[PDB]
Design brief:
Chains A, B, C, D, E, F: Keywords: Heme, Iron, Metal-binding. The structure is a homohexamer. With about 280 residues, chain A is an alpha/beta fold. Helices cover about 40% and strands about 15% of the residues of chain A. Chain A contains ten helices and eleven strands.
């Protein structure tokens, strides 16, 4: 069984730790910020732009990542250097998660723990769905948009078949975007969609800074119901990297509470609320 | 000499403390937040809406305030109740300051200290003006706007003969507003003015929250050079209440440094900087 | 259904938010500090001294408050201006609460949620009463006093039929005051009552500052068992404004734990404990 | 029943407070730091070196401590001065705890509460043992060492029949030390033992400072699996003074979670984790 | 020259560090809390009650302390064990300081630095005296009392020939106490003295907690001008242990500013101000 | 003159800001963390591994960096895309600095300010050198080592002609390394050198965490005088990237104070001190 692991992809790293493999992690990419301790480990750079020399320097027994791990030539030279490179799935669905956990469990030597993790996860999701069903008795599902930002610019809208879409659906909202994947869209169209709430995952900014930057670069969003009712929600971007992660259930609880404010929220930083208005 | 003082108007209160009369203050209005300890004294409400019963309860020997202290009927019933009511000047000029200090010094019994205060103040201002003169050798004075907000709404623009205008001029900027006093102006006109920087004094919000609210309610400001270059500066609103206060010199140093970024700033929380852009 | 709400009275505002009406609140009075976000909304001043021009500026569809909302002439001119003014009950009893929730639920469009709120509240109270019954098996109910202070002065003692009395009773204590309402009482009498504990709700001070101010202005309290055993408890004053609020249950848990120290406390900032003694 | 208590021995003090006797404590030794408020009470010095004049000055009705309370001559002169000196047991076992609680309950007048405390404690321990049994199905008990340090020096290893040994066993680990009591051992032997994890209870240092000091003065520990896998755990030293204390159950939950990382931890500052590695 | 030093007496330790001997300090007594790092060194207990075994364990080349270091028998057994024990002076005067610095400089090997330290110190004091002279032109020296407390109790008043008296005089105040040394005095007499300000050095409490405890145990102080004008100043107690220390000059600047509020304070945590009143 | 700048190399970015060009910076590499606001700008990745698509997305008018900016192919494709790529000097000497400032000043349009910056810098250095000369009268220059770490591993020692060497020399120390550039060296040799102090610049760790990691991976350093006397100094790594930066003067003041502890330090987070010992 591999003893020295290097992990690329936030959620993958969280899973390794969750399954008890923290002491086996010798290096991680920049999107791996949870738990907090992972930030103090050697860095191999961004997952989409791995540093070959960086991973080799750690004498890794295994390198794990998803489809979004690369570039391809660097991964190839790594394999040629004797490094065991595994590719898990970043797809936004339980089938993928259950498959990733199966593998991680095996390479870690804790197949039972991996099964228990899958079980607790689905249980959390079943509970989240039941809470939503009850909440929709007094309020219909709101139309929402999830956008990925870079200091408020270069907006990418989460369309169908993305982690962002999965998160919006699982939290009880209706994704207003009908396209596939993450794609840029004119603010004009976005404003026309008039979302009840907008979820912002910014790579560089957080809280009010993220909100302010968003409005600076996309003034058209100010006339949306989302901006008017103080519903520009800031989400922890790492929640969307490397496939479905262990913190999503807590994330869904916070989002669904914001989506159905007239319902007693579920029990249990990853979601900043808006305190400003427009009228 | 009066022993129990109640003060209405932020800057007036700061002066009493500055001259050593802190132990004589038994109550203050809500705009008196400096020094921090003044927030722990009994409150008589907002200066423009004093609570008669509130001041009487403190058995004050003297009540001080400016023209903006009121309403008139309440001040009258107070005088009729035997309370000594003094009215100082809130006018934005050294002549007024020097006159206010003269009186405060006398009622406090420290005429010499009051003179020294006037002297240090003007010295600070002379130094600020010389720094600006040198700074304008490599950069011309920027056109700027100062706005008073309420959670980003109900914008009042500081025109000529206001504390806001005095502050912009003393900090080396050109007030773009040509009207008199504080008046509401359409965002359309404001955006047309295209300020290099915008100074925001919000009664309820601070930092990025203030910026975000401002943009939400006034989307048109996003296309100004101010928003584009990350120059929506947030100023401590108390710096503009009750006439010229003792903290303005430090305030001018921060503003002038932001107005002439290519000059080594002057020596020495009251000014939050912008970190977002638009491009 | 009203879309823009202005609320006067801490507890009322908390309820609107609790029922999911936060995005409909456009302004609140100074006693509305919970949740924290409410402090960033436009302010209409103190509930007992509303600013007419202040509420009108917000174009409110409805203004809610209790009997303690005023003054009367200002509320009248508001009604004459077309503003819908509703008056709920501030009375210290479940009948009033259940009636306030009924109305809020209707004007908010969530009658079921309001019913669920009433249900959870009474359940919390039933649980608090059972815990007390069990706790009184090893210790008798302590005689206590609840005082409202202003920077430690102008003390008002909570007598019968006040929110303070309701809170003392519901927390398992015996209110030593036999008068009706909130009334000033000489420290001499208060010290004679010799409370086992004293609860202080100060408008301006908190923690040790509140304790120190209390003792400075009322030296006679130092010889009470309360002062001797380090039981000058500081309570969040907003818990007593605008009728019975949603945070009282958590407040009762903290108080009852302090009142019966030999009992395992109930599950779950609003109550500062004393660490000083006298002997 | 005694009204003024002076307590020597961290855990004893915690118990007095836990049973509701906080207002009866007029003084404590330096190892009594929990709850936090106990640090603000008069100090009688270190438990092993009590200040006679220090306790007498407090006019105590009773002085409680364990075998480790002294020196003997000082305790004697105290008894001769009329002070009631009680000696409880510091022995690392439930029989001793149950006997200490029995006495404290009686002198405090809350025999029932003391019984309930014993009951909750054993219940917590039964639950901890069951969790461990389940955790050992996928992982065998790890060999561990517990050391008491002084700014990383003067290391004492917890052998058999010590609170440290009790804590390691109850948390699911195997104490690698075979000696009796706390004894100094050469780092050479300690490194040879090659612990999977090392628990450090430092009197002066905490967190990374404690780790760094430990390695500075005992370089040989760097080659242990504990140092390599980032498992130099820092434990709150007060958890080991004055017999079995009320916080141990929470302490065991944290330790056992660190000892069996592949198990979902138990529900609920006293244990700092290691983030550094060696490879 | 000695390489391993153990120091008893706050101010002595500060001097060793100030002269550059920090790396030579291997242990200190509990009153040595400055700089902050000294708290992380091995502890030898309280200066007046040194732990023989504690110092020996550190293999010290030298042990330094003042007259207040003891007890005598422990110091004797230490000398008999080969430990070099030096006794400096704790007397409240420059002659003593200059003599202590002379010795420390020699044993540390930096005679010139010690001379420079004496020079800077006296210069600081000359500047403090000149500032006071100018301040007394508009205000006469206030009568003040300095008290040493233990969680607000066991009050010792600083009389003539004490560090407390030296500090009051050097800060521009008149010590109202006419006795010699530190002695207990009835609150009745203390209140009669009616100090303009009271300086409290509490061993266990700080800030408002110290104030509250003081008033609880000495209610009579509430009617003093000091309590009425919010002038119960809390001083860092370590400033008074082990003779004249390097932080006194900064301490004098803060005190003199509080004593002459109508004077612009001198340039540059050791003095907490009072925010409560009585009227 | 270029309006949109992207900067790679910490010190270069600091200079642009220092000269007043902050509003012209639209993106920076990961080593640009000062001022703090630069962390909120879009990221182009690590300087040695720039993201082509990342810079192009910002529509930059100019890209600045040093020799260490790359890789080469990416810079080439950038030039081919019309991006103006400038290469400044990272060499550790004033000639290089003065040349970089000359260029930055010109492209920014503030040649005079750039000259003033060069002037203030050299003045700071002249003052630092004079302070050292005086300090060496009572103490000889200490032999020191500066190491660059990665979570305490992969140690690179700063030899001749490196920013690390420049910093050690300018701070009054003697670099014990005789090799050229940054090179790995066995801990055996490093320990043999027996440095009086060791300066650690860790890419991932800070403070005690950095110290602990260093000792874990390099146990041999524990027997050095540096470890024994608590002189493992942690330096802000960004101070060594992108050539000589504006914060070095403050950095030199802190280091030289640590190198000559018996000298009164110079006036004015970038240097963490060691509090642990070995003996
Ligand atoms: C906080 C500042 C710094 C950060 C964030 C940083 C980050 C990185 C990253 C992400 C890598 C790729 C992974 C790896 O190979 O380790 C790297 C490589 C490297 N870094 Fe840095 N670095 C910093 C400071 C420095 C400094 C001060 C030096 C020392 C002169 C340095 C020298 C190197 C070297 C030699 C490499 C190898 C690859 C190459 O040079 O092309 N870095 N750094
Ligand atoms: C944090 C919450 C509170 C704030 C911010 C607040 C603030 C104020 C202010 C500004 C005044 C006017 C000045 C004065 O006359 O003292 C006032 C008056 C008054 N307050 Fe409050 N108050 C609070 C809580 C309470 C509570 C809990 C009570 C007790 C039942 C109360 C009873 C009164 C009374 C009796 C007056 C006299 C005037 C009147 O009742 O119309 N207040 N308050
Ligand atoms: C932090 C400081 C300040 C606080 C706490 C404060 C608070 C208030 C409050 C509570 C009201 C009543 C509600 C309303 O009508 O909006 C009010 C009204 C008003 N305030 Fe202030 N204010 C502050 C600063 C200022 C400043 C700097 C100006 C600008 C010159 C200003 C101008 C006004 C005006 C024009 C009104 C309308 C009513 C009147 O002027 O009589 N306020 N303020
Ligand atoms: C933060 C600094 C201080 C600490 C930590 C401290 C601690 C202690 C402790 C633990 C005791 C033993 C218990 C007792 O008898 O109360 C004690 C006793 C005593 N302390 Fe201190 N002390 C400090 C400052 C002072 C100061 C400034 C004075 C005043 C001149 C002082 C005068 C005394 C006296 C008179 C005793 C009685 C026993 C004797 O003097 O031998 N202490 N102290
Ligand atoms: C935070 C808690 C603790 C504090 C504040 C503390 C403090 C002290 C002090 C001040 C001394 C005297 C100086 C010396 O000889 O080192 C001492 C001695 C000693 N301590 Fe503690 N201690 C603590 C925890 C412990 C623990 C958990 C043990 C381990 C079983 C322990 C065992 C000893 C021993 C063996 C001595 C030698 C003298 C004797 O036992 O009589 N201490 N301690
Ligand atoms: C906190 C987490 C994240 C960090 C630290 C991060 C960082 C980066 C960096 C440094 C770049 C290179 C510069 C650039 O082209 O902008 C980049 C590119 C990119 N990132 Fe991320 N990223 C994060 C999250 C995400 C998420 C959630 C998405 C959305 C699905 C995403 C999608 C992309 C895309 C599409 C690119 C373009 C290049 C490519 O895909 O190969 N990133 N990111």
């Amino acid at each position: 069984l591999p003893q020295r692991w290097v992990s690329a992809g936030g959620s993958l790293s969280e899973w390794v730790v969750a399954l008890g493999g923290e002491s086996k992690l010798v290096g991680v990419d920049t999107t791996s910020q949870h738990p907090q301790a992972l930030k103090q480990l050697p860095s191999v750079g961004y997952q989409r732009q791995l540093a070959a020399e960086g991973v080799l320097a750690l004498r890794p027994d295994i390198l794990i990542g998803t489809e979004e791990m690369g570039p391809p030539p660097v991964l190839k030279q790594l394999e040629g250097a004797g490094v065991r490179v595994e590719t898990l799935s970043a797809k936004p669905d339980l089938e993928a998660l259950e498959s990733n956990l199966k593998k991680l469990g095996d390479w870690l030597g804790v197949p039972q723990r991996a099964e228990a993790a899958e079980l607790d996860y689905r249980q959390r999701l079943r509970r989240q769905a039941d809470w939503i069903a009850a909440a929709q008795k007094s309020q219909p599902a709101p139309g929402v948009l999830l956008v990925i930002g870079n200091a408020g610019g270069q907006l990418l809208v989460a369309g169908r078949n993305t982690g962002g879409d999965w998160v919006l659906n699982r939290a009880g909202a209706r994704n207003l975007a009908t396209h596939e994947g993450y794609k840029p869209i004119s603010v004009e169209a976005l404003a026309a969609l008039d979302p009840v709430a907008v979820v912002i995952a910014d790579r560089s900014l957080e809280g009010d800074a993220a909100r302010a930057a968003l409005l600076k670069q996309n003034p058209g969003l100010a006339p949306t119901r989302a901006a008017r009712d103080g519903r520009l929600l800031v989400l922890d971007p790492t929640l969307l990297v490397g496939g479905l992660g262990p913190r999503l259930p807590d994330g869904l609880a916070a989002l669904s509470a914001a989506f159905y404010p007239s319902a007693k929220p579920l029990s249990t930083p990853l979601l900043g609320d808006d305190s400003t208005r427009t009228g």
